[PDB]
Each structure stands twice: as structure tokens, then as C-alpha cells.
């Protein structure tokens, strides 16, 4: 015997509550247009924020990374807002164990939340309230699908015509240990922009690899330690490929500098996306590159800067000895180099058909395995290049490495 | 002095007609929760064709070139359906004289329009009235761009649990020009499936770049020769590199036999598609994978077998002069072979910055008019080396190039 209501086209059973949050609104599991939705029931005094959200979302839900909106109803008391129904939240997907990824792989998952934060900054929308709670993880399609989604627009602005900012004159949005320093910094001069939303993406970022850390430490202790620039990435292990690489993009997302923090369409091209053949694509087109470049020139003197870390003093001394005895046939390749190190490599994959069995056995098939026998002997090789190459990111053929 | 009307959520205005649908239906410009938005209205005979298209809608519209689909209201009278507002449809896009593409490039919308169908078909659901009337040019967005969409789900049939085909005792569905052969066909033992769409998509396809023509003549005579297997594809010149890619492609698409129709996705892996830095990524691909084949073995053989066409006897000769005299001293690259016009490519690729200034300057910069130096002096190099490396094609190194059922 359960009950049910009806506010016009919305429909919804009071005893499916979803979840509660902000102003005691209350989110129904309900019904639109013979379709299952979420059913969010606003207080009146709250009218403000909904308005607000329904508007911002009729603007930007037709990407598939931001949460579709449906209808709205007023009641004689409520305001009532359907959206799409969502499986879980990105705190669900990262703390719950033995969670049924469906595909939906971390960096994708982050990939696809950035997208969507591009999109709304693509409008002029800023969201100030990024948070794993904001991130919706989506019912699985009809090929049993699921992806990331941004949503609870209720404390999104849209920048006003010309320009990129905006005051702090409503106040301070947002949830407590999530916010960018700049929103609340009193001596503060510049205003706010797009970048606050980069900085808790960027803590978000964190959160998800770390598998539920967050970079400011714990919950009560967050937002002072962001205030006063306390991260801690120590989750994201220095030895570590995957981690170093992550690390680089993580800590100039939550840099305390908001000019320094990297826009989302910028975040998107970072070598944290990419798959393993692209990475060993950029490994092949800067060793091509600086074959012909003078040891004296400032490339090949930026690449080698700092390069005894990288190679581990004599990266010949740090590969399998199938493939140091096919090295010995050439010797050329100086072992206190990055780029000799780079050079074989690339020659390597060149002529990988024609190798020996036993040296093709300790690399690996192309182009995963063999990019990873070096970047994990190598774990800084990729962030090194990558850096010291930034001489060349205007150059026609680095254009999709780096961001314009 | 203009009225409105609103039921539920849907409101319009009846003097703002869109146009006219089948059999009584008409479509209004409109409002659904302050969004813009176009409104069918269906007569009661027409129910039957509207919660098809509503469950359809219901189902696939979470694609961006799969029009958008918001709300259905039910009157005494009619039923409404609201649906995302589109500026216009292709038809006015290609035959309009002087329609601001807006960014939208032709070929772009081939690429849109058939993921849409891709979308489709993945989901069990045949279109089988796809035609420029129902293919859209969506509002510009913020930024002032434009996408192509599906509409028109009415004719929609979604196959059966199980079922990779369809029956036709419904009879033909389809508007006269773009109807599949075999769904007209007295003999056919082979009930339709999916390639109904692709065969109306091929004859798109060749509306478009020919900006209005029809691989099967005029309005008049063009499902007479359908059946009849009368296509014509004037419009693609023989010699040249994008038209001949084009015609590969679409002579497929169009093919009698449905079997030997691509799918919608084998269509979005097509050469048709590709960059022309993608083009030349894949000339060097194959370059590299056959620099250590035997010269008597099947892959060198398939690309040599008919090369005398494609390379114009002596690609040394059809070469530009600064060129010519910077590929002498490399006798190793016979002038009659088409994997030695492959390497001499791939190394003037590969060497690029070290060559002078005047072989530079003829070849053009890497990668976009380089490319185009050689696939507009053979313009069926590409065609040819993709055709034949299709031995390849299941290999790790060739896979993103071809198609895998």
C-alpha cells in the first residue's frame, strides 16, 4: 500500500527518497513522460537557486557529460525539478569496493568529467561547487554502458557579457573543503574565473586515483590547509610512471596561483590522457626531431638538463640483457644521455620486425609493451621530454602534444 | 493579433508552420518549458506512427546527430509531440544556392549523419526512409555552429528479439527515389535488413558532393532506375585523388546486392573520412611493413598488380624537376614500382627538414600540401595501396584503418 504524487507532468512516490542535502531538499526516484527520473523537491525559500539551476541547465545539458534536464513543476508549496536518474555518485564509484566499473575506467571517468567542465566554461558558465557528490556516475545504456556526469547547477554562474570574472558579491558558494583559496582570501585582488572550478577539479583528480584521499588532508581540516596551501600528494608514488606523470598535471590544477592553474580544454591534452601509443608517438617524433640538432643547441642542452635522473646515471645499465647485448652493436648511444636514450628507442621500434626474438621478447609486442619496458624503468622520462620539448610546442608537428 | 495554443507543457502558435508531414500531420513552431522547440501534431489515424516514434525517440536520442526528443501531449483531439528545433533540413542545405555552411563542411555532415544511422542501427532499428527531407541542419549554438541530425522515426522498424531483418508486408515505407532495391523486388528471396539505410545513405552521400545531383538521375525516373541498376556518378571525376576515393566508397554504398553494402560503422572507417594527415600516416605505415616483404611475396605482389596505371609507367617522369633531381642518385627506387614511389615518400617525409630549400618548396610543408604533392599527381595511389594492404588489415599496426566485423 504505498502512495503516490502528481504535480502536473511529474510524478513521484514519497517513500523513494534518493537522498536529502542542501536546504532539506529532497531528491524522489519519480516519473516524466513515462520515463524514470530523479525528482528534486525545492523549499520555497530556495526558489532563487532552482530558477537559477533549471535556467543554466536548458543551456548546457545536450552534452553527454552534463546531466539531462527534463521538466519543472510549481506546486502550491514545492518546486519540483526533473533529471535524468543517475546509478551512484563519483564517491560512491570510488569508495564502495568491488564497484561494477562497466568500463567506465578512472581517467575516462575524469576525461569525461573535464569535457563536461570544458563545455560549461565554453558558455561562460562557471560551476563553483565541483565535488564528488556533483559527479554522477549514469544508469548503464542498452550496451551496458556507463559514464561520468556534472550536475547541481544550483550554485552556477554565468559570467556576465564581456567578462572572464566574476565578484564574490553573492557571498562565498561552494562546499567546505572543495573551494579555491582565491574565493576566500580577504587580500585577494583578482577576482575569481573559470579557474576555481580547475582547482577542485583538480582535488577531484586526486581523490579518484588515490582512491579516496583528498590533497588538503581530512574532512575538517581541508579548507584551512587550502587556504594555506598545505597539499600533500604523497599517494602518487615518485618511482612510478603513472603516478609522476599524474602528479605533474595534479599539482598545477590545485596551484595556489589561479593564472598558473591550467584551463579545462588545456587539462585535456596532458600526457595523463594519453594511451600508450600516443605516448610512444611523442617518444618517436622528438627523437626524430633532435637527430640532427647540434649537442650545443638549446634543445638537445634543455633535454639533457637534469638527464642523470632520468637515465639513472646509465640507462644501459637499467635495461634487460637481451637487449643490452643488441645494444652493443652499436655503441653510439652514449649511456649519460636522454637523448641516446631516446634515439635507441626509437630505433628500436624502427626496425622492432627485424629484431631478434629473444630482444623482442624482453620489449614486448608494439606499441604498449614496448613503451612501457622503458617508461617503468624510466618513470620520469616522459614528464622530462615532455617538459624540455615545450621549445618546440609551436612546431606543426607537436601541435597535438601540447595545448594553443 | 496572433493566438496561441497550450496543452500541457507544449504551447505554439499556429500562424508559425514549419511545414507539412504525411498524411494530415503538421509541424508548428513552439515552446516546451521555455525551450524552443518544433511541435508535430498527429490526427487520430496517425496514432500508430506517433508512439512508434516516441518510443524510438525515447530510446536513441541520446546521440548528437539523433534529433532530441522532449515531451509527447495527448488532446480530445490530436496528439503533440515536441521535438528539438532545427533551422533547416539538407535538402536546403545543398540546393539552396549560397547556404552559409557555418563551419559545417559537406563531408563532416556525411560523417555526422552516418554516426547518427550507426547509432541507430547498434540499437536494432531500421530508418527505412532516410532521404535529405529528414536529415537536419540543427540551430547554431553559442558559439555559432552548426551539426547535422536523423529525424522522421515514424517508418522506424524495430527488428524483432533476434532478428537481423525484417519482413515486407507492410509494403514499401520509403519516399521514391531512395528506396533500396530489393525492397521493391518481385524475386528477392532475402527478406531486408539494415543495408536499406546504407544504400539511401550512399545516394546522400553523392547528393551532397555533387551539391544536387543523384547517382540515379532526376526525379522523375529515379527509383525506375534503381530498379533498373542505371547509376551514374558523372560528377566524380576519374582522375582525381577526392573524387575517386568517393566514388570507391559510394559504389559500395548503392550496390545492388545489399550483402555487399558496408555497415554504418565499416562506412565511418572509410579513406572518405580521413585527414589528409591521417592519409599520409597511412602511406608511411605500409611503407615501413613492406621495406623487409619479399618482393615475390603476396603482399608486394597485390600492391605491384596493376601498378602501371596507378604510378603513370614512370612515377620519376610525373614528378615535379627539383624533385626529380633530388631523387636520382636513389636507384634503389625503380621508377615503375608502386612500393618504391611508397618509400621514396616515406623518406622525404622522414628527412624532411634536412632537404634543401628548393625540393621543399615543390613538395610544400608537412603534412597537409605534401600529401596532396603526390595523391594529386596519382590521384589512385591511395585507393589502390588501401585496397590492396586489406591483407594487413587484421594485423595491430593496421587495424584503426579498416573495418572489423
Given at each position: 500500500?504505498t502512495?503516490?504524487?502528481?504535480?502536473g507532468?511529474?510524478?513521484?512516490?514519497?517513500?523513494?527518497?534518493?537522498?536529502?542535502?542542501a536546504?532539506?531538499?529532497i531528491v524522489?526516484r519519480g516519473?516524466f513522460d513515462?520515463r524514470?527520473?530523479?525528482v528534486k523537491?525545492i523549499?520555497?525559500?530556495?526558489?532563487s537557486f532552482?530558477?537559477?539551476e533549471?535556467?543554466?541547465?536548458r543551456?548546457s545539458d545536450?552534452?553527454?557529460?552534463v546531466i539531462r534536464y527534463?521538466c519543472?513543476?510549481?506546486?502550491?508549496?514545492?518546486?519540483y525539478i526533473?533529471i535524468?536518474?543517475c546509478?551512484?555518485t563519483?564517491?560512491?564509484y570510488?569508495?564502495q569496493?568491488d564497484?561494477?566499473?562497466?568500463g567506465?575506467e578512472?581517467?575516462?571517468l575524469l576525461?569525461?568529467?573535464?569535457?563536461?567542465?570544458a563545455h560549461?566554461?565554453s558558455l561562460?558558465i562557471v560551476?563553483?561547487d565541483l565535488?564528488?557528490?556533483?559527479?554522477?556516475?549514469?544508469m548503464?545504456?542498452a550496451?551496458?554502458?556507463i559514464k561520468?556526469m556534472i550536475?547541481?547547477?544550483?550554485?552556477?554562474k554565468?559570467?556576465?557579457?564581456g567578462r572572464?570574472?566574476?565578484?564574490?558579491?553573492?557571498?562565498?558558494?561552494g562546499?567546505?573543503?572543495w573551494?579555491?583559496?582565491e574565493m576566500?582570501?580577504?587580500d585577494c585582488?583578482?577576482?575569481?574565473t573559470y579557474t576555481?572550478?580547475?582547482?577542485?577539479?583538480?582535488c577531484?583528480?586526486?581523490?579518484?586515483?588515490?582512491e579516496?584521499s583528498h590533497?588538503?588532508?581530512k574532512?575538517?581540516?581541508?579548507?584551512?590547509?587550502i587556504?594555506?596551501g598545505?597539499?600533500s600528494?604523497?599517494?602518487l608514488?615518485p618511482?612510478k610512471h603513472?603516478?609522476?606523470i599524474?602528479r605533474?598535471?595534479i599539482?598545477?590544477?590545485?596551484?595556489?596561483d589561479?593564472?598558473?592553474?591550467?584551463?579545462?580544454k588545456?587539462?585535456?591534452?596532458?600526457p595523463?590522457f594519453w594511451?600508450?601509443?600516443?605516448?610512444?608517438?611523442?617518444?618517436?617524433?622528438?627523437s626524430?626531431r633532435?637527430?640532427?640538432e647540434?649537442?650545443?643547441?638549446?634543445?638537445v642542452?634543455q633535454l639533457?638538463?637534469?638527464?642523470?635522473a632520468?637515465v639513472?646515471?646509465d640507462?644501459r645499465?637499467?635495461?634487460?640483457v637481451?637487449?643490452?647485448?643488441?645494444?652493443?652493436?652499436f655503441?653510439?648511444?652514449?649511456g649519460?644521455?636522454?637523448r641516446?636514450?631516446?634515439?635507441?628507442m626509437?630505433?628500436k621500434?624502427?626496425?622492432?620486425?627485424?629484431?631478434?626474438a629473444?630482444?623482442?621478447?624482453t620489449?614486448?609486442?608494439?606499441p604498449?609493451?614496448?613503451?612501457?619496458?622503458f617508461?617503468?624503468?624510466?618513470?620520469?622520462?616522459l614528464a622530462?621530454?615532455?617538459?624540455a620539448?615545450?621549445l618546440?610546442?609551436?612546431?606543426?608537428?607537436?601541435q597535438?602534444?601540447?595545448?594553443?
Open positions: 500500500e502512495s503516490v504524487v502528481i504535480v507532468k511529474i510524478s513521484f512516490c514519497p517513500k523513494d527518497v534518493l537522498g536529502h542535502g536546504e532539506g531538499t524522489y516519473m513515462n524514470d527520473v530523479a523537491r523549499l520555497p525559500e530556495c526558489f532552482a530558477d537559477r533549471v535556467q543554466l541547465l543551456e545536450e552534452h553527454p557529460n527534463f519543472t513543476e510549481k506546486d502550491r508549496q514545492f518546486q526533473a535524468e536518474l546509478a551512484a563519483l564517491q560512491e570510488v569508495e569496493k564497484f561494477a566499473h562497466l567506465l578512472p581517467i575516462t576525461q569525461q568529467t573535464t569535457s563536461g567542465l560549461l566554461h561562460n560551476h563553483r565535488k564528488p557528490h556533483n559527479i554522477l556516475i549514469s548503464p545504456n550496451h551496458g554502458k561520468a550536475s547541481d547547477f544550483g550554485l552556477c554565468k559570467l556576465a557579457v572572464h570574472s566574476f565578484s564574490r558579491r553573492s557571498g562565498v558558494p562546499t567546505e573543503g573551494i579555491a583559496p576566500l582570501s580577504e585582488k583578482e577576482n575569481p576555481v572550478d580547475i582547482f577542485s577539479a583538480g577531484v583528480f586526486y581523490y579518484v586515483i588515490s579516496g590533497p588538503f588532508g574532512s575538517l581540516q581541508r579548507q584551512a590547509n587556504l594555506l598545505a597539499c600528494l604523497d599517494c608514488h618511482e603513472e603516478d609522476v599524474a605533474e598535471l599539482e598545477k590544477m590545485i596551484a595556489m589561479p593564472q598558473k592553474r591550467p584551463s579545462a588545456h587539462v585535456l591534452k596532458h595523463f594511451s600508450l601509443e600516443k605516448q610512444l608517438q611523442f617518444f618517436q617524433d622528438v626524430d633532435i637527430e640532427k647540434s649537442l650545443d643547441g638549446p634543445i642542452k639533457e638538463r637534469g638527464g642523470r632520468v639513472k646515471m640507462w645499465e637499467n635495461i634487460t637481451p637487449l643490452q647485448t643488441d645494444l652493443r652493436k655503441r653510439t648511444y652514449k649519460g644521455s636522454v641516446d636514450l631516446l634515439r635507441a626509437r630505433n621500434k624502427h626496425h622492432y620486425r627485424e629484431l631478434p629473444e630482444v623482442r621478447e620489449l614486448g609486442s608494439l604498449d609493451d614496448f613503451v612501457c619496458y617508461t617503468s624503468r624510466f618513470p620520469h622520462l622530462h621530454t615532455y617538459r620539448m615545450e618546440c610546442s609551436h612546431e606543426r608537428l607537436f597535438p602534444y601540447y595545448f594553443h
